[PDB]
Each structure stands twice: as structure tokens, then as C-alpha cells.
Design a protein around this ligand. Structure first.
Ligand SMILES: CSCC/C(=N\Cc1c(COP(=O)(O)O)cnc(C)c1O)C(=O)O
Ligand SMILES: CSCC/C(=N\Cc1c(COP(=O)(O)O)cnc(C)c1O)C(=O)O
Ligand SMILES: CSCC/C(=N\Cc1c(COP(=O)(O)O)cnc(C)c1O)C(=O)O
Ligand code: MET
Lengths: 387, 384, 386, 387
């Protein structure tokens, strides 16, 4: 079996005009040889292109790369992770359906499920999905989907994806997993029983902090076709230039992830043993609840995680006195980022959900990059040891 | 005129750069916890994350906003992103939408397949007749949605008239002005609440970008559109915004030529023995010319005309040397298309007949080539 | 005869994967089907590509466009106007050769001819090329080239390209013309007997102020081959993204030029009649020396020209209280630029050559955009009234 | 001492509008505040920009990254390696000067030095620079520069940079080193006594096969100024978009080089023990003449190197039956390339110089990528073991 590094570097497809790099198809439309040839493409008959919203060669190449690492039937790229999330949920849910989702999700996913879905007649319950029994207790005759993020952003709360999949499969619900925090090198939800695996490509997959994008991959040709049908009407698209950049970033994804994983575990162990640090939420630590599920169902760990200082003042002193880490939201970049969930990425999360999520002002989230780990640790150590 | 404004948009230069930089970035740095917290609460000036706001995209938004006379503008990944964000940001389960019966194929698909799955009642009706709008009206009607002139038939709706109905009755009016551009059609100026465009067409005009834009009359309505966009996720990429803003620098100048070329081409087709009929809003023969002459200050260059058979239309479309057989419109070069088997193939048969779309119709988008060269191209294809 | 607008909008070449817009080939290298195929391509046999420095399809597409408007045998694109100039001269001149150049040139052209060429053993004379007899007098047995800009940057001085070309033809010398200021819409030096016609694409051709690039076009197949051979070793390349932007800009070149021309003429007649202005150097003004040559040899005029204030203080006042016009170097953008040549574009030229050029602290160079000309005139009027 | 990985991920310079990624300044000109401010900038007084040919902020950020790893006084970026090479030689050499250059150089470098320089009155000798005595024997009163490429493209011939630097320093000659083949992670010629270190950025530094570019770095402020002075008149510029791409590629340069070095050595050892292979020219092999010098003067090895088959026919059969390696010129890309120097990269080199470069139809050059090394070795093995 060919390694994933080789696969990403040698993706299926013909070269265009013998170009070694795949060209940027910065075009809106494509030409027809004849009215019949154009009519046929519109009926899905024959090979070729029509209009970039329906399909763009550069974007399609990026889609093939993702599909090959997810083990999917097809992938669809989007203008953002949120575009991938919207199109993987609202392409299937309709008025009268029920959604069960994790109670600890990315802030704007909470916003989508909590503000927009109910306006479309979709019933939603945010549930502690780390407990299968609670998922089952929340099930109704009209449940059509379960949506999980694991490890969750930002607390790293782990859900039993396999266990929950069994229930979805027995009851006729789709299982959709946001695997953004771990990347497809380490988490392959289609192997664990998910029907759809999605990512904010803005994070690890692109890895270079210079693109916003999303991707979704489906186990079934029918589901990916439905997703793309939704996309053509809802219109969240990956631009050709952004696709070119995301494919290029993805060329180094396996080696970047290996370094992210190792650096993040070492930073977590350093923080864990430090006097100033109360607790560290990294799913690769033996102290972490759900470490056992995470080590069985994933093949590695992303390097974004959260830790608890003794006070909000202590957290602010740390965050404001770093020279290598950069104070900023987002994650999964080559350089290390740090932020304060309570007042930033999760500050829009309604108060009842934010306390069920366990987000307090003492918490700091760090997204460890690929800098030399000793430099990262020395930067944290000097700030923690300030006068 | 409009040109000076588009060339000299408000804002500071970034590091004294004459061209506005491409902010190819996802995230932005904070000076402190407080400054970041403040930005998330909408206080102070600055950026957080490109999905919430990118300086390059905002520059393009400001350009459109200035020309629409709006309170604000939002850019998207496509015209469809603009459309679904300008409708589903407001409509919810139990609401009713009245839409023009003739729309772009994918707008039909959105209103016809997706909106009712979300419990929104939709009636497509003939909006060229205001009394028909009044008759479709219900107590739960919250929006009327119009294209005018419509794609592909160029059917004209009375925007000013329908806006009066909407204002009186507590409903938003949303107008897709793609086919005409904000040089010649300003729906907010006619009483509309929202004006939107596929920027992929005239506004960018160089056939190398897909993008959308929507502009709201009120600050609250643009804030709601952007709130939806933040969760729905149809963004204009910074490189595409750089390209759209650049394309828009020649917009007024391209439109003058598109308009004049389109009129001359339509007239040539209208007196040609082989052509049954020409649907161009600027022709005296076209039904709705009087309304369009009054409500618009010019005409786009994309219109439809009728051949005597499918075979005759196939022969025309397939023997052109300058015009390109392709979908889309509003590019600098001339495009030509067959609505029945292409742009509108997926439109349900019943909606198809109601639109009046038959296999004998050909749709053309006249570029800014010398008119005589394009007339000569059509001439040899129609005669030989 | 198909019109230039149509020609630029419908360039020769097949589509790539049916794409309407020509793709951006952001690649360094190309794949071969076989050893023999790669080897054949290195020998110039067969069709295809090897490596973007030798040839990039996106760049070649921009090259084709320029070659169509110039009526050339071929065109080469570069990373700047200076790259086109260097490669159009040093590809031919060698130690012991003599070059005759116009006395009024872009500042960096002066620096090239005056600092670099003599280090390479090439003799250079800067002479007043508005008088053909002065070209004849400057001639030597080793003269191999005449290099001209017309109208010259920044004074707009006009040379008789057509007359100078006869002399060059008669005497075995190449005539190279930098037609940056006028664009290939209105000035086609190869039609006037020049051997090479070149531009800073950074100006009108691209026209959107967002790219630096050059292009050179040769009358003969052998000369454009030599230019590209020099380019391969010298390495001033147009990037694929910049070529994409330059072709795109060029799609509107003819309509943009038409407006530049009309606008600049109107601005110049306004300034010529205003009491604060000593003279206006626009080659389209009947008052201008060499207007009659420029009217015969060109089919229109660029919109960059120079005018004279009563003092340096007046110049400074004007340049610093404009609200639409932007204080910046460069020219031929969609929007109006304004510049002080003495201390900016031509600051580095030796006092000696500057004297010869007629450049003084009282001169101001404007590059009129495609704004509503009433807004530009109103901007100027407003500033002149303080 | 902060690691190069961290240094490259954290370049000096203010952020622009708080942007985390450095913006692409796709502009030709810049605005002045006043006639004086603009006049001042043209005299080198004050901070700010004028025109992209003279300086562009996105390009300057890439220059500063290169300058930080070379240990230079300044770096200059160009449209191609050839642009860097022209500007690093013709900026200093004038009519009547003498240049000593290696006899085994990149083909177009031979073209520059043997066709163009002599046309400008510059005297040039191509010398075997692996022998310092031969360098000295070729020295003349007017010698002004020694130009070296080590290991040489394509034969990997090693020069003694340190030993040749002594002679340059004693006699008033500039030493210029093309370090393209090794990257600035492993070869820092300014530390060995060179005056100028340059690269085709098209190769390892960018690493992604999608840009052509050059860079040159000088030990002295005066020499970098002269180079840039030459650049503004010769006009070989890095485009803003290409500088954005090269800086982005360079963010992963240290980890890519580590994988390239290891893969390359393992592939060379596989080939060296293989029955079909006569000889392997990898400077990290103990059998390689020059290994001892390469091992002392570099801190690693690039992964492009040459090997000898038993025949031209055997070479062609190998090169045309690979499924992972790609038949193409260029090198230092993330994916593996392969090429026939005798009929491709070096087919334009005069037979005189080809004979002494040691280039024959039996030689194949491979540029080993970052694919899993077992997948690379398996691909070569299956082609070598063909019916
Ligand atoms: C509040 S601003 C910070 C951006 C951000 N997160 C994004 C993200 C998305 C959304 O992906 P888009 O950003 O649309 O590409 C989806 N799914 C997950 C697990 C995510 O972490 C953050 O910093 O936590
Ligand atoms: C596959 S068919 C080609 C596209 C096309 N029309 C598009 C269009 C859109 C949608 O805009 P987006 O394509 O999403 O930027 C919105 N509004 C109007 C009046 C439109 O005409 C056409 O060829 O009629
Ligand atoms: C002082 S810096 C301003 C640039 C400028 N002129 C440039 C120019 C070039 C050089 O072209 P490149 O800039 O290399 O694309 C060549 N030929 C002519 C007639 C030129 O005017 C100016 O503002 O006068
Ligand atoms: C003219 S071939 C250029 C590519 C590169 N310099 C090589 O050695 O492969």
C-alpha cells in the first residue's frame, strides 16, 4: 500500500498541456464544441466542463486529493468550513426532521444550528455526545442526522464516533463528522462509520493561514451528488486560486501533521507539569477523559488544545507576553497561535451552552505550529515566569 | 460621472500602495486580549478573520455600495450565494414568497426545490403585471423577488409599482439586476429593499471570476445578510475581489459599448428574414419597453431571439467564428447559448412553458468587439 | 479587416480544456512523454513546452496579443520595461560597437546607456534625434544601432522615426523604438521602418497600475530569436500571473486609449489657456514643435505630457493640493497621476544630460486617466486658484 | 540560539493592517505624501516605497527571509536563477576583467559565461575548481572573480569553497557561489568565505515546482546595493505573487530539506548496490571523490544526483517506465523528477565542455522528492527489473 505522502504528491488525473503543476483555471465559463456536446454535459452525459460553479478543473483536483485521503465516494470544496457545514446538513435536513448535535462545537456552527436551522422548521438538540446513552435518550422517530465534532473545538471533548455510528446505522440517520481539529491524516470518520466527513480547510489541510475554505466528503455517490446539488444553489464555492493554494498546502500535510502532533504533545506535557497551569485538555494525555476513545479511533492528534490558568489575569499576562506565539484566532497554521475562547472564538455562544461547554475566562487555547518545539516551550516558559 | 467614483474609492492606502493590496490571509493578529475582545463585540476599528471581513473584499463591497446608493454591500462566492443569502436570511417556516415566473435556471431550482423544504411557501407569478402580484398576495407574504429584465426572455417587471405594493403591505422587495448592471438599473433607487448581482457577469466583465454581491437599503438588513453569510459561508476570495474591483474600473465604459452594440445587433436581427422575433428591452416592438425606458437609464447587451426551427438555431450557433458557444453572459467577448437545452434545461416543464422557452430560442450576450465584426459573423452564419 | 478590438478579444491559439479564459500556468517545469520527445523539444523539433524560462503558455498568449497589434514576426515578454530595453540592446551590441540614442529618455534608460553599456565596451552617444541630420553627423563606422523614444519621457520631444529608419537601413544599423508613451494602438514603429518596437507594459498596455512588465517585438524571426536567447540567460521573465493580468488589461486597451487620448488633449488645451502656465508640451497641440511629424507618423496620442509652472514653489503648490490626481511616479494607469521629474523620475540623470534634456524644477508631468475629464479639469482649476 | 525553522516562520517586520499572512502588493506604483517626501525617497532618505522595480513590500519580505538564513548583509530577489546569476556577475565584471568559473555548471550558466560575457570584453576561463592548484594556475593580474557551483549540476562535483576563498581574499577577487543544489539549510557560502551566495529559488527554496525565481545575498551592504542597482536597470524582478509563493514555500524549507536529504541518501544507496547501476555520484556517499570536503563544508546534502547505467538504452528503459518519478527537467520539487542530461539539461553545452564535464548518454539525473522513500525505491526497482 502506497503511503499517503506519495498519494497526495501523485494525484489521479491527466496533466494539462504537459504542465507539471496543475494550472489555475481562473475562468467563469467553458466553450462547447457543438450544441449537442453542451446539451449532453448539462444532462451529465460525456466528459468536460460547463461553468465553474458546476465544476472547475483546479477545484476538482483539490477535491480528488481530499477524497483519496478520506476514502470517500467524492468530495466537494467550498468557500469556507461553514459553507461545507451548511451544505452537509441543509442539503439533507428539511422541515419536520430532527438533528442531534454535540453540545461543544465551533461557535458559528452553534450559531447555524441554533439560529438558522429552527427558522427552517428543523428541530435541533445539542447533546453531550461523549455519552452514547444520552444520544440514544435524545433520539426521536424523526431523527435524521447526528452531527459530531471530536475532539471538540475548543475543549477537545471526545465523542465515541464508532458507538454513535452503530445507532445512526440502525435507525436510518446520517452521521456527519467535523474532523477539522485532527486532519484526515489522523481521523478518518468514513472508516469509523460516518456518512460524511468535513473540514475547515482553512486550518491544517491548507496549513499556511492564507486561505479560507471548506471540504466535505461522502461515503456514497448519491450523498456527494446531493451535496454538490445544494452547493450549486447555495453558492459557497472554492475559488480557483484558493484551490491551487489548498492543493499546494496539502502537498506537505502528512509531514506537517507529524510535526504538529509531536510538538503539541510535548507542549502539552510541559504545560501539564508547570506550577501556573491548573489543567491541560489535550486528548493524547493519559489524564484526559476520553483519551482511551481518542487513541483507539484516531491514528494521531492535532496540536490545538486548551489549558486552564489560575485566573483570567494570569491568562492575559501569559497571552500578551509571548514572542513566538501569535495572539489571533484560527488554528492549524505552520506558526503557533494562541487565543482566549471566552472573549473571542466562543464569545457569541449563548450563556447556557457556554457553561454546558465548560468555557471559563481562565482558559487559553493554543494551536501549536511547526517551529522548533524547544523555542515554543522557551517562549511559554519565559512568559509564565514573568515578574 | 460613475467612472471617477469607481477609480477613486474612499479609504486609506495600505503602506502608500497605489493598487489596493491582496489580503490573501485567513486571520488577523491582536495587539492585546482587550483589543481582540473589543473587535468581537464590534467596538473599535480592525479585522479578525477573513470570513467576518477581509480588507480586499471590503474595498470591492464599498465600490458597489457607492454605486447602488446602499447602506452597505456584501460580496459572495457566486451570484447564487448572494441570492440565497438575500432571501433565506429573511424568510422562515410559515412565510410566503412571490417570485417572478421567469428567472435564471438555478434561482428556479432554489425557490422551487430548497425553499419549500424549509417550509417557505413560494408562488412564481407574472410580475410584468402588478395586479397579478396583488392577487397572489397572502397574509403571510414577506417578500417579492424579481429579475428585470428577466433571464433569458428579458420580460420587464414594474419595480417602482411593485415596491409601492411591498411598502404598503410589509414585505421586502429584492431585485436581481444582473442583466443590466448598476450603471443602468439601481433598484434601491426605485423603492426596492435589496439589489443583487451575479458579479460573474458585467460587473467583473472579464469572464475569469465567479462572484456575487448584495446591497441593502438599511443598515439592519445588510447586517442580517452578513450575519447569514458568516454561517452559510459563501465568501468572495481575496484574489477574486482584487479581480472584481479591477474589472469594475472599466465598468461604466464597457456598459456604454455593451449597450450600443446590443441595440445595433438586436436591430440587425430584427430585420433579418431568418429571425422570427427579438426580445430586447430597448426595442420599440418589445412589450415592456415603456416601463424599462422609464425605470432604467440604459440597457444590458444580453437578449433572446427566435429562429424558425431547432435545426435553424443549431446551424446558426454552430457556424459562428467570433461569437463563442458557451453559457454565462456579460463578458468582454460575445457569447451565445441555447436556453432550452443549456441554462434552463432543468426548469420544470410547466414552469418552462409559463416562461415561454422553446427549442427555437437562441440567447446572445453581445461583447465590446467592433459591432460590424459581430454583425458580419452572425450574417455569414445565418446566410451560409 | 477585422478590427483591433475584436483581434485582442479573439487571440489565436486553441483553448486549454475548453476553458474560456486562458489558464494561468503557474508552473516551472513540464512533463515529457518519452526521452525522445524531451530531446526533440530541446532541439526545437515538435510542439510543446519544457520549462517556463524557455516558454510558458500563459506568457506566450500575451506575447501573441502584442505581436498581433505590432505586426511583428514575434514578441518577447519580460519582468519589466527595463528588461525589455536591456534585452533589446545588449542582445545585439557588443564591445567595440557604437550606439546612438535620443538625448531625452526615461531616467533608468539613461542609467543603462550611460553607466552599464560603456563598462561592456560599447560606445554611446546621446544626441538630439528630433533632427535627422544630427543623427547623420553622429554616425561612425562602428554604429550598429539607433535607440529612440518618441514622444520622449518626459518632455514629449518627437523624432522622425521614419526618416531615421531610412538612414539605419542605408547604413546597416538596427532601429529600436520605445513606444511606451503612445501604446501600440497609436504608434507602430515596425510600420515606420523600425527593427524593434518595445514597451513598458507597466503603463498603458496593462493600464491598471498593478503590474510591472516589458515587451519587445521584432520585424524578423531571427531578431526575436536572438532576444529570447538573451532573455534565457539574462532572466528577466514575465510571471505567469502577471501575463494573465497583462492580457486581461489589454482586452480594454483600445477603448482605454481612445479615452486617454481625448481626455489628455482636453486637459492640455485647458492648461495651455490658463494664466498660471508658461507652456504645455503635448505633441497633439498645434503649438508644439514636431506636432506635424507626430500627426503623420502616429494614429493618436498618449495622455502623458509635461507643462511649465512660473516657479518651483508654484509647481509644489499645485502638485500638493490636488484631490483626484495622485502624486506618484509611473503613467498610463486608469487614474490620473502627477509627478515632478527634476526630483523624481529624472533625479538621477547627470546635470550634463539634464541640461540637454530641458528639465527644470518648474516642470510638472501629468498622466491623464480615464476619469470624467471634467473632474480632472475641476481638480486642476481648484488647485491653481489658491 | 533560535532554530532556523522558527526564524523562517517569524520573519522580522511589521504586520500590514494586522494581517497574519503578509499581503500581496500587486501594485506598480506607490503614493507620496508630498513632493519633499517623494524627493527624499529618491535620494534614499526616509522609510517608504516608490515603485515595485525599485522595491516591493511582498518581495522585500522574501528577501529578508533568505538574508536571515544566509547570514548576509542583504538579499535581492529576481525573476529567475539566471537573473540572479547575471546580476551577481555583470554588476561587478567589466571589460578587461577576468573571471575564473567552474567547468561543470548549469547549462545556461555556461551559455551566459561563454557567449555573453566575452561579447562584453570580459575574459573567462572554465577551470576544474575541485583542484585549488588549478585555480591558482589560472589566476591573472586582472582576475576579479571566481564563480563556483558545488556540488555541480549535474555531476555533483565538489569544490573546496573554503580553500578557494583564501586565494580570493588574498588577491582581491570576489567569490560567488551558486548553492541551488544544496539549499541554504545545508550550504552557507558566506560562512565559508564567499562574498555572494545565490540560488535558483525555482528549485528547493520554493520547493513546489510552481515558480521561477532567483535570489542573491551579499556579505557586504555595498555589494548588495550594487547588485540592486544592476537589477533596476537590467530588470529581472520577482513578481509580487511569485514572492508571496516563494515565502510560503520557504516556510517548510527546513523540514522538506531534512526529508529530501534522508530520501536522497537512501535512494543513492539502493542504486549503488543495484546490479544494473555502474556508479552513483551522490556527494554523501563514501565512494564519492569529494565526499570528505562536502562533509566538512556542508551540514547536509540536497537530493539531486546522478547515476550511470550500462547503456543509453538501459537509461531510457528506466526513465520511461517509472510510475511515481516524473520525466522532466528541473529539481528540488516535493515530488521526484528524473531527466537525461546528455539529451536535455546539458544538450546545449559545447562538446569541448561536455567531454570534460564527464557527461555521457549513460547518465541519468534524479531529483528525489519527499514521497515515502520505500515507494520511490519500489518504483525504481520495478523499472530496473523489467522484462
Ligand atoms: C470565531 S473565528 C475563528 C475561526 C475558527 N474555527 C473555524 C472552524 C470551522 C469554520 O471554518 P471556516 O472558518 O468557515 O473555514 C469549522 N469547524 C471547526 C472545527 C472550526 O474550528 C477558530 O478559531 O476556532
Ligand atoms: C450554469 S449557467 C451560467 C450562469 C448564467 N447566469 C447566472 C445568473 C445568476 C447566478 O450567478 P452565479 O452564476 O452564481 O455567479 C444570478 N442571476 C442571474 C440573472 C444570472 O443570469 C447564465 O448563463 O444565464
Ligand atoms: C522613476 S520610476 C517610474 C517609472 C516610469 N517610467 C518607466 C519607463 C520605462 C521602464 O519600464 P519599467 O518601469 O521597467 O516597466 C521604459 N520606457 C519608458 C518610456 C518609461 O517611461 C515613469 O514614471 O516615468
Ligand atoms: C533549460 S533546463 C532548466 C531546469 C534546471 N536548471 C535543471 O537543471 O534542470
Amino acid at each position: 500500500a502506497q503511503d499517503i505522502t506519495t498519494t497526495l504528491l501523485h494525484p489521479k488525473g491527466d496533466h494539462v498541456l504537459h504542465s507539471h503543476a496543475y494550472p489555475i483555471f481562473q475562468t467563469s465559463t467553458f466553450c462547447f464544441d457543438s450544441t449537442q456536446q453542451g446539451a449532453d454535459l448539462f444532462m451529465g452525459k460525456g466528459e468536460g466542463h460547463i461553468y465553474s460553479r458546476l465544476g472547475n478543473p483546479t477545484v476538482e483536483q483539490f477535491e480528488e486529493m481530499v477524497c483519496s485521503i478520506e476514502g470517500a465516494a467524492g468530495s466537494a470544496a467550498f468557500g469556507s468550513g461553514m459553507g461545507a457545514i451548511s451544505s452537509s446538513t441543509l442539503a439533507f435536513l428539511q422541515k419536520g426532521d430532527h438533528l442531534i448535535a454535540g453540545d461543544t462545537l465551533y461557535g458559528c456552527t452553534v450559531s447555524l444550528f441554533t439560529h438558522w436551522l429552527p427558522r427552517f422548521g428543523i428541530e435541533v438538540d445539542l447533546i453531550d455526545t461523549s455519552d452514547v446513552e444520552k444520544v440514544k435518550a435524545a433520539w426521536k422517530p424523526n431523527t435524521k442526522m447526528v452531527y459530531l465534532e471530536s475532539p471538540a473545538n475548543p475543549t477537545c471533548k471526545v465523542s465515541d464516533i464508532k458507538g454513535i455510528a452503530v445507532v445512526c446505522h440502525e435507525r436510518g440517520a446520517r452521521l456527519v463528522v467535523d474532523a477539522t481539529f485532527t486532519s484526515p491524516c489522523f481521523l478518518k470518520p468514513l472508516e469509523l462509520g460516518a456518512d460524511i466527513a468535513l473540514h475547515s480547510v482553512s486550518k491544517y489541510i491548507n496549513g499556511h493561514g492564507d486561505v479560507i475554505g471548506g471540504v466535505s466528503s461522502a461515503k456514497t455517490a448519491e450523498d456527494i451528488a446531493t451535496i454538490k446539488f445544494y452547493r450549486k444553489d447555495a453558492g459557497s464555492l472554492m475559488a480557483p486560486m484558493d484551490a491551487f493554494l489548498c492543493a499546494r498546502g496539502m502537498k506537505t500535510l502528512p509531514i506537517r501533521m507529524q510535526i504538529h502532533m509531536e510538538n503539541g504533545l510535548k507542549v502539552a506535557k510541559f504545560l501539564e507539569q508547570h506550577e501556573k497551569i491548573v489543567k491541560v485538555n489535550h486528548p493524547g494525555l493519559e489524564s484526559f477523559p476520553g483519551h482511551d476513545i481518542a487513541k483507539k479511533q484516531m491514528t494521531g492528534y492535532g496540536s490545538t488544545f486548551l489549558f486552564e490558568m489560575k485566573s483570567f489575569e494570569a491568562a492575559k499576562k501569559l497571552m500578551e507576553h509571548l514572542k513566538v506565539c501569535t495572539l489571533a484566532v484560527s488554528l492549524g497554521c505552520v506558526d503557533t497561535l494562541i487565543e482566549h475562547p471566552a472573549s473571542m472564538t466562543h464569545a457569541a455562544v449563548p450563556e447556557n451552552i457556554m457553561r454546558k461547554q465548560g468555557i471559563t475566562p481562565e482558559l487559553v487555547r493554543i494551536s501549536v505550529g511547526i517551529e522548533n518545539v524547544d523555542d515554543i516551550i522557551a517562549d511559554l516558559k519565559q512568559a509564565l515566569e514573568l515578574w
